[PDB]
Design a binder for this molecule. Sequence first.
Ligand SMILES: *[C@@H]1O[C@H](CO)[C@@H](O[C@@H]2O[C@H](CO)[C@@H](O)[C@H](O)[C@H]2NC(C)=O)[C@H](O)[C@H]1NC(C)=O
Lengths: 42, 64
Amino acid sequence: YNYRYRKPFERDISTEIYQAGSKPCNGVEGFNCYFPLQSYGF
Amino acid sequence: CTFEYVSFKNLREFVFKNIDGYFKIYSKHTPINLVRDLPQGFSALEPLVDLPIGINITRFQTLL
Ligand SMILES: *[C@@H]1O[C@H](CO)[C@@H](O[C@@H]2O[C@H](CO)[C@@H](O)[C@H](O)[C@H]2NC(C)=O)[C@H](O)[C@H]1NC(C)=O
């Protein structure tokens, strides 16, 4: 659970949700509204 | 959160730019007579720091 992935030398630590479609997602996860980080299946 | 550092007659000049995530500062100081607006003449600024920060700047604000 500790090991995760989503200019040069960027570090975007923001957890703010993908508007993967045109939806005003407002932090609500659902179809076309997705949390940007995933843990590796190690 | 991944960084920390510690070190009208006066005119102070500065330049700030962010490149490859490094943040670069240059400066110069002089006494002046023409206090109204920037005195017509020449004097180059020289470097102070080259901070390895990696931050996404688009705004700034002065602190009084
Ligand atoms: C500044 O924030 C933006 C997102 O608001 C980050 O954008 C991505 O940057 C990487 C390279 O670092 C690109 O490959 C992606 O295509 C960008 N995403 C989008 C949607 O444009 C960026 O990483 C941040 N920059 C810094 C220096 O932290």
